[PDB]
Design a protein around this ligand. Structure first.
Ligand SMILES: NC(=O)c1ccc[n+]([C@@H]2O[C@H](COP(=O)([O-])OP(=O)(O)OC[C@H]3O[C@@H](n4cnc5c(N)ncnc54)[C@H](O)[C@@H]3O)[C@@H](O)[C@H]2O)c1
Ligand SMILES: NC(=O)c1ccc[n+]([C@@H]2O[C@H](COP(=O)([O-])OP(=O)(O)OC[C@H]3O[C@@H](n4cnc5c(N)ncnc54)[C@H](O)[C@@H]3O)[C@@H](O)[C@H]2O)c1
Ligand SMILES: NC(=O)c1ccc[n+]([C@@H]2O[C@H](COP(=O)([O-])OP(=O)(O)OC[C@H]3O[C@@H](n4cnc5c(N)ncnc54)[C@H](O)[C@@H]3O)[C@@H](O)[C@H]2O)c1
Ligand SMILES: NC(=O)c1ccc[n+]([C@@H]2O[C@H](COP(=O)([O-])OP(=O)(O)OC[C@H]3O[C@@H](n4cnc5c(N)ncnc54)[C@H](O)[C@@H]3O)[C@@H](O)[C@H]2O)c1
Ligand SMILES: Nc1ncnc2[nH]cnc12
Ligand SMILES: Nc1ncnc2[nH]cnc12
Ligand SMILES: [K+]
Ligand SMILES: [K+]
Ligand SMILES: [K+]
Lengths: 464, 462, 461, 462
C-alpha cells in the first residue's frame, strides 16, 4: 500500500460518489457531447493529445473532461474562477484518476498555484500539446511564463468572449504563439450559452444568494450583448422592472424593442468622473444592478455611492473589475452574510453596526455570479458549448501546428471559428435532445433557396 | 395643379393620407433626422429613382424623404394587396408619380411597375432603383437592359430580394451594384423580427377577429420573420409550435420555449399524404409560413389541417402556401376583402353552412400588409433610414459613369458600414427616450473600440 | 316586407351573415345551448327588450334567444360599438334591431325607444337584457308601468350591476334581476381576457403605433385594468399602473408593474402643483379602466407628453375629461374615432402643430370604438350566461305571481356555480381541453361531488 | 446559557440565522410596521401561542413580531423538510422554545409538535394556536381537549388547514373559533400564487439544475398554487400543459395560454393502465402536483412517465403523488438530500447507469420548501402580517373566557375584514415603492366607497 494517486488538489475527495451521481445524470442532459463520445471513441482522435484545461470545474466541465479522456486525451485541469468549482465535480474527476486542481473558494494565490499544477507535472513542464481555456488566464500564463512549452502545443480552444478578445489582441500584436479556435462564436455556443445560459442561471444565483423576491422590484442591467440579453430576460421573466444601459446603440435598440427602458447611470450618458454626473434619482430606485459588459468599471464608485440602500450588486461578466470592488474594500466595511454573500456598509471602513440600514449586498465578491452563487449554466445548455470544444480540440490537434515549418506557422497562426456545418450538426443533436423534429428540405426547396439539402442553410454572414 | 401622372384608387383620400403622414413623421426620427441633416446638401439632387415597395404611409415618408433630399421618383407597390390607398393618394396629390392601389390584379401589378419605368411611353431617365422583393429589378434586367446602363445602383429591401440579387451576381447577370439594406441590424433585427411581432397578430385580428389565446399555432420557419411571428402569437397566448429545416434556428426555437415539430413524420417530406403528421395538423388552429421558400404549406398539409383553421403567409411571395392547389380543387367563398373561406368539400359550389373549410388570409400574400398595415412607422423608420443612406451612397458613387474596368471592380452586393447602422440605431433609441452611455476613453481602450464606435466587429451577430 | 328596424346599410346583411356563421363556430357554449334547448323551447312566449353592443357576437346571442323561442327587439348600448354588418344581418333575418356605428347621443336614445315601442305603442315585453342599465334606467324612470309585466332583467357589465345595487339598497328596484357579470365565465373570461385581446387591437387599428418600447399608464387594475395592462405589456410596452385599491395595486406589483400615481404622493388636490409632471411627460399612452369619474383629468391632460395616445376602455366616457378638451382645445379628426387634440388653443390649429394628444373613440369604449371589441370565443362565456339567465327568469314568471310573495323573488342574484362550471366546461372543450374526472375517493377527500360544484361560492379563482 | 428549552440541528448556526433575519426584516415592511404600530400597546401581552409552521427565516420574523407584541410562543415546523436550520438556531438562541430541523423523521415531527404542547412534561398554559396545515390543531383536538378549553382561537395559514377546520366545524368537533388567514387576498393571491411562482422553479433548479426552457411540463391543478406554479415553469420557457377537475379553473388555464390535458383518456380515471394517456405522459419531462388532493399523480402515471422525468409536489401533503407505490416496487437512489432517483427496473438494487428512472424531489413533500427556501420574505410579509392581525383579533376576543352561551355564538371560522387585507396590501405596495392614488370625495361617492376603503364588496374576486 503506497501513497496512491495524489496528482490533484480538491476540497474533499469523499464528495466523489456524489459528483459521479451528478455526472451520470448530466450525461443524459448532454446528447451532443455524449454523441461525440460515442461517435469518436473508435478513431481515438485525441490519442496522444495532452490537454491543459482551465475552465470552471463544474459537473458540466466534468462531462467535457471525460469526453476528451474517452476520445484518447490526457488532461491536467484547473478552474478558471476561484468560486466556480463544484467540489463534488472536482472530487469525482480526481477520483477517476484525472489530474484536477480546483476547489470552490480559492484565494488568488491558490488559483495561480492550481493553474501551475496543470502546467508542471512532477516539478517540470508537462509535455502538453493542447490548450483548452475559458477567459485566457492559462493562455496568458503559458505565453508569459512558459513560452518554451508553446513550442510543442498544437493550438488553443478558447471558450468565452473575453478570452477570445485577449487572443485577438495577441494576434494583432504578433504575440500569439499557437493557432486558436474561437469556440465562443459558434451559434450553439454564443447564442445558447451566453444568452440562454444566463437566462437560466442569473435569477438562479440571485435567489440562492439572497432569496429576494424579484417580482415588482427595479433592476438595472449594464450591457445588452448576449449575456446582457439573457440576463435581462432572467430578471424580466421573474417580473422585475428592468432598465438596460448600453454603449452600443444597436444593442440599445434591441432592448427598447424587447420592451426595456434604456437608461444611463450618468446624466445624458456622460461619465465625467464626478459625483454630479450620476443620475442619483435613477440609482436611488434600483434594487438590483447586474454588470454584463466584459468591460471595466461599468458599476463604478460614484454609482455604488448613489445606489438605493440595500440594493443587490452582482457581476455575470468574466472578470470582477466590472464593479469597483476595490473602492468598496478600501472605504466600506464588509460583513459576510454567508459564503459568496457580503453586506457592504457605506457607513465607513472600520466596523459597522449590525443593524445599519445603509449597506449594499454584493454577490460572489463581484466574480461571475451564476457560477459563484449557483452552478452556472445547466448541462443541456453547456452541451452545445462543450460539443464545440471537443470538435475544436479534435481539429487543432489533427492540424499539428507544433510540427510545421516556421514560415507556414505564420500562415497557420490564426484565430478561427468552427465551420457552420459543424455548428449545425451540434444544433441538431441539441434539438433532438428536446424531442424536436427538424424538417428536411426537398431537392426543389433546397434548389429554391440556394442551399444543399444537408446544409449549411445560411451563409457565414447570417446573424440568426 | 395639372399633375396627372399617377394611378391611385381615390385621389380624394389624400387629405386623410396627409394627416397620417404628418403623424408618421413624428414616429420616424431617423428618417426625419436624415431629412434635416441632408436637406441643405441635396445629396440626391439629380437622382431619379424607380421605387417598388408597398405603398404604405411609411413608404410615403421614405418617398418624401428622398424627394426632400433632391430626388425625383416614380413609384409602384411591390404587392397587389399592400398599398394603403390614402398613402398612395397623398403621394399623388403631392405631385409624385405613383401607380398603386390595394387589390390590384397581377396584370395591373405588372402594369404599375411599367408605369414607373416608362414616362410618356419612353424609358424614364432613371438612374437609381429602390426595390423590395426584386420584381422591379428583374423587369429591368429582362426587359430594359439599356436603362440599367445608366442606373448607378439598386437598394434592395428584403431577404428574398437579396437572394435574387445574389443569384444574378453568381451568374454574371447582375448589371448594376446593389446595397443589401435588409442586412443592416436596424433592418433585419428590427423590421423582419419586431415588425412581424407587431403586425402579424394585428393582421389576423383584423381578418378573422379570432381569439388567439389558448389556441394551437404552427409557424413554418424560425428565421427573423419566423422568430417575430412566433412571438406575435405566443405573446397573445397561443400554444406555438415551430418547424424549421435549419437546426440552429430550431435550437433557438427550443431555447425560446417553443416545441419544434415537423409537418411530416420524422421530418421527411416525400410528397405522399401518408407522410403528413395528421394528428399534429388536425390540432392546429393557425398556420403561418415565414420561410421565403416554396410550398412549405403544401396541398397534403392543407388537406390535413383541422377544420376551420386559419392559413396565412407572412413571407414575401404567396407560393409559400399551395394556393394554386386550392384554387384548382376547392370552392372559395369571400368573407370580405383578403379573407376567404376555402371549402374542402369540392370545387363547384359550397354549402353556406359547410363546416369543412379553411380561412385563407390575403389570398396567401403577405398577411401583415394585406390584412392590416404592415410594420409600424417607428419600426419602418430604421429600414427606411437605411434605404436613404444606401440611395445616397450608390448615387454618389455614380457607377454608371465609371469606365468598364472600374465598374468591374465595383459590381457587387454590399451592406452599409456598421457605423451607419449604429447611427440609425442611435436615432431610434433616442425616439424611445433611451439614453446610450458614452464609453470613457479607458473603457474603449479596454475593449478595443473608439468612443464613437463602431462598437462590434462585423462578425458580431447581436 | 319587413320594415321594423333601422340600420346603417341593409345591404351589408350577407356579409354580416357570413361572419355570423363563422362566429357560431367560435361560440361552442352558445351553440351548445341552441342544441340543448332547441327542443324544450324554454323561451317560447318570451318577449325580450335587449340593449347591448350590436356586434357579430351579440348577433349570435340574439339568434340563440330566437332559436330557443324568444321574440326580441334590439338596440346597441354604445354609439360606436355596433358592427353595421351585424345589425344588417339581424334585421335581414326579420329581427327588429335599431343600431348603427356612429350614432349621435340623440339617435342612441331614439334606438332604445324603438325597441320599447312596437307599432307605435309599448311592446308587450316580458323580459329585459341590458348592458350598462341605460335601457333599465329608461324603463324605471319613464315606463314604470311596462315593468309590471316583465319577469326580470339580466345585466351584462360591472357598471350596470352597480346601478342595480344602488336601486336595491334604496328599494327602488322593481323587478328581479340576475347579475351575469359575477359569473367567473363572464367576469374574468370577458372583463380581463376580452380587454387583453381587444385593447392593443384597437390601439393598432386607430393609430398603427408601435407599442414595444414605449411608456403606458394604465389607470385601474380591476379585471379590465388587469387585462389592459397585459395587452400592452405583452406587446413590449413599459407599463405603469395606478390604483386606489391597495390590493389591486399589490397584484400589479406582483405581476411585474411599477405602481405610480398621476399626483405627487397620490394626493389629487385639484391643483396643477399636485401633478407629477415628470411622470406624465414620459407617458406615451394612458388607458383608463376604472368605471370611475375623471381619472384622467384636465391637469393630467395638460401635463401629458406631446403626441401621447389617450383612450378609455371603461364603460363611460367621463373617465377622461373630454369635456375640458372640447371646451379648450381644437379637435382634428384623423379618421373616424381618431382625433388629434391640439393644446395650442380652441380657435383652430396649425396642421403641423406638434403639441397635440391623440384621443381614440372620443373617450368612449376604445375596444368597441376602434376595433370589434372582444372576440367571439370570449363573448361566448358571457352570453351563454345571459341565455341561461334569461331562461331562469322567464321560466320563474315573476310577473304572474302574488303581490309581495314576489318580495322573496325581488333580488339581484347571480347564477349557480354549477351553471358557471357548465359554461366553463363548454368553453374548455372549444379549446380541445380535456377536464379530468375525480375518482370517488378523490371527491370524498376534498369534499366535493364528482359532478361539482368544485369550489365554494367564496372561492376567488 | 441556561436556556435549553428547544431542539434544533445546530445551535452554532444562530449568528448566520440572525444575519439573515436582520435582512429579512428589511424585506417585510408590513410585519415590521405591525411591530412599530403595536409595540407600545403590547396587544399580545399574556398570549401564549402554540405555533406550527415551516421554521424558515420568514417564520422567524413572524415569531419575533408576535413576541415583540407581548406574546410568548412555543414553535414547531409543519413539514419535516421545510425548516431552515439557521432560522431555527437563531430563534432558539433568542430564548424562544423551538423544536425543528430540516430532515426530520415522521416520529421526530410528531415529537416536535408535542414539545410545544407540553412544557416540563405538563400541558403548557397555551391560549392561542397558529397553525399551517391543521396538524397541531388535529393533535390538540384528538389528544388535548383540556387545553382547548383555555385556548381563544386558531389562526390557520393554508388551504388544506382551512379545509380540515371546516370539516370539524361541519361535524361539530371544532372546539375553538378560527380565522382563515389563507383567504385574505394578501395571502391567497400573494403567497399561494406568486410565492410558488418564485419558489417552484427555484426548488427545481436547486434540486436538479435541469434546463427547463424547451421542455414539457404537466402541472396537476390550476388553483392558486397551480396558477403560480404554471407561471413559474412557463416564464422559464417550459411548454406547460395543465390538468384540472374544475372546468372554471381549466377555462382560466386556456385563456392564460396553456393547453389543458388529462393524464387519463377522455379524463376518465378507471384505475387501469389502459386509461392512461401514455403518449402524452411519455412526452412529459416534469410533473408538478398542486391540488391538495390525493393520488393526483398515481402509480399508473408514474409507470407511464417519460424516462428521467422529474416528479414533484408543491401541495401541502405528500400523498398527491403515490410515493408509497414507488417505495413498494422501485429502487431509490439518493442523489443528494431531498433528491432521489427512482429506478423503475425493480425493487432490489439498480444498475448505477440505468436510464429508466424518475427524479423525485423532497420525497414528494412540498418542493419549494423542501428543495429551496419556500416563498421569499417580501411575499411572506403579507401572509404573516395577516397572521399577526388574526392572532391579535382572536386573543382580544378571549373566547375561552366567554360564557358557554356566548361561545356558541362565536364558534366559527372567520376571515379578516377586507379593510385589514387592504392595510396589509398598502404596506406591501409601499415596500415596492408603489404610490397608491387617493380617491377624491366625489370619486369615492361616484363608486359608492369610503376614501379609506374598503374599495370592493366582499364578493369581489380580484
Ligand atoms: N457568466 C457566464 O456564464 C458568462 C457566459 C458567457 C460570457 N460571459 C462573459 O460575459 C461578458 C459579456 O459576454 P458577451 O458574450 O455578452 O459579450 P458582448 O460583447 O456580446 O456584450 C457586451 C456588451 O456590453 C456593452 N458594454 C460595454 N461597455 C459598456 C458600458 N460601459 N456600459 C454599458 N454597456 C457596455 C457592449 O456594448 C456590448 O454590447 C464577457 O466577459 C464574457 O466572457 C459570462
Ligand atoms: N411580411 C413582412 O413584413 C416581411 C418582412 C421581412 C421579410 N419578409 C420576407 O419573409 C421571408 C423570410 O424572411 P427572413 O428574413 O425571416 O428570412 P430567413 O432566411 O432569416 O428565415 C427563413 C427561414 O425559413 C426556414 N425555412 C426554409 N425552408 C423551410 C421549410 N421548408 N420548413 C421550415 N422552415 C424552413 C429557413 O431555415 C430560415 O431560417 C422572406 O421572403 C422575406 O423577404 C417579409
Ligand atoms: N370595454 C369593455 O369591453 C369592458 C368590459 C367589461 C367591463 N368594462 C367596464 O370597464 C370598467 C371597469 O370594469 P372592471 O370589471 O375592471 O371593474 P373593477 O371594479 O373590477 O375595477 C376597476 C378598478 O378601478 C380602480 N379605480 C377606481 N378609481 C380609480 C382611480 N381614481 N385611480 C385608479 N384606479 C381607480 C378600482 O380600485 C378598481 O380596482 C367598468 O366601467 C366596466 O363596465 C368594459
Ligand atoms: N407549497 C406552498 O408554498 C404552498 C402555498 C400555499 C398552499 N399550498 C398548498 O397547495 C395546495 C393547493 O392550494 P391552493 O391554494 O392552490 O388550493 P386551490 O383550491 O386554490 O386549488 C387546488 C386545485 O386542484 C384542483 N384539483 C383537485 N384534484 C385534481 C385532480 N385530480 N386533477 C387536477 N386538478 C385537481 C382543484 O380543482 C383546484 O382548483 C393545498 O394543499 C395548499 O395548502 C402550498
Ligand atoms: N408598413 C410597411 N411599409 C412598407 N414596407 C413594409 N414592409 C413591412 N411593413 C411595411
Ligand atoms: N364583441 C362584443 N360584443 C358584444 N358586447 C361586447 N362587449 C365587449 N366586446 C363585445
Ligand atoms: K403601418
Ligand atoms: K369581435
Ligand atoms: K425564503
Amino acid at each position: 500500500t503506497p501513497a496512491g494517486f495524489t496528482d490533484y488538489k480538491v476540497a474533499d475527495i469523499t464528495l466523489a460518489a456524489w459528483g459521479r451521481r451528478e455526472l451520470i445524470i448530466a450525461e443524459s442532459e448532454m446528447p451532443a457531447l455524449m454523441g461525440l463520445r460515442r461517435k469518436y471513441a473508435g478513431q481515438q482522435p485525441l490519442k496522444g493529445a495532452k490537454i491543459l484545461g482551465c475552465i470552471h470545474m463544474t459537473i458540466q466541465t466534468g462531462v467535457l473532461i471525460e469526453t476528451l479522456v474517452a476520445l484518447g486525451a490526457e488532461v491536467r485541469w484547473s478552474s478558471c474562477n476561484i468560486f466556480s468549482t463544484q467540489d463534488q465535480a472536482a472530487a469525482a474527476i480526481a477520483a477517476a484518476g484525472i489530474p484536477v486542481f480546483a476547489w470552490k473558494g480559492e484565494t488568488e494565490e491558490e488559483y495561480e498555484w492550481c493553474i501551475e499544477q496543470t502546467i508542471l507535472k512532477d516539478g517540470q513542464p508537462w509535455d502538453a500539446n493542447m490548450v483548452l481555456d475559458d477567459g485566457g488566464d492559462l493562455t496568458e500564463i503559458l505565453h508569459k511564463k512558459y513560452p518554451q512549452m508553446l513550442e510543442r502545443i498544437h493550438g488553443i480552444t478558447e471558450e468565452t468572449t473575453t478570452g477570445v478578445h485577449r487572443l485577438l489582441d495577441m494576434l494583432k500584436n504578433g504575440t500569439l504563439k499557437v493557432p486558436a479556435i474561437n469556440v465562443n462564436d459558434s451559434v450553439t455556443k454564443s447564442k445558447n450559452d451566453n444568452k440562454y445560459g444566463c437566462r437560466h442561471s442569473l435569477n438562479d444565483a440571485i435567489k440562492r444568494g439572497t432569496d429576494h423576491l424579484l417580482s415588482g422590484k427595479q433592476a438595472l442591467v449594464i450591457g445588452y450583448g448576449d449575456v446582457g440579453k439573457g440576463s435581462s430576460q432572467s430578471l424580466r421573466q421573474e417580473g422585475m422592472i428592468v432598465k438596460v444601459a448600453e454603449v452600443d446603440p444597436i444593442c440599445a435598440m434591441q432592448a427598447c424593442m424587447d420592451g426595456f427602458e434604456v437608461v444611463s447611470p450618468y446624466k445624458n450618458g456622460i461619465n465625467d468622473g464626478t459625483e454630479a454626473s450620476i443620475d442619483a434619482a435613477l440609482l436611488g430606485k434600483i434594487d438590483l444592478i447586474v454588470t454584463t459588459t466584459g468591460n471595466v468599471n461599468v458599476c463604478d464608485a460614484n454609482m455604488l455611492k448613489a445606489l438605493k440602500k440595500r440594493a443587490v450588486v452582482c457581476n455575470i461578466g468574466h472578470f470582477d473589475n466590472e464593479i469597483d470592488t476595490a473602492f468598496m474594500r478600501k472605504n466600506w466595511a464588509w460583513e459576510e452574510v454567508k459564503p459568496q454573500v457580503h453586506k457592504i456598509h457605506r457607513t465607513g471602513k472600520d466596523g459597522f453596526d449590525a443593524h445599519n440600514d445603509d449597506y449594499l449586498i454584493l454577490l460572489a465578491e463581484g466574480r461571475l455570479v451564476n457560477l459563484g452563487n449557483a452552478t452556472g449554466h445547466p448541462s443541456r445548455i453547456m452541451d452545445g458549448s462543450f460539443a464545440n470544444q471537443v470538435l475544436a480540440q479534435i481539429h487543432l490537434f489533427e492540424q499539428k501546428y507544433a510540427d510545421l515549418p516556421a514560415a507556414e506557422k505564420a500562415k497557420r497562426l490564426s484565430v478561427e471559428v468552427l465551420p457552420k456545418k459543424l455548428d449545425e450538426e451540434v444544433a441538431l443533436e441539441m434539438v433532438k435532445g428536446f424531442g424536436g423534429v427538424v424538417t428536411q428540405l426537398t431537392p426543389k426547396q433546397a434548389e429554391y433557396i440556394g442551399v444543399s439539402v444537408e446544409g449549411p442553410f445560411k451563409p457565414d454572414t447570417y446573424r440568426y
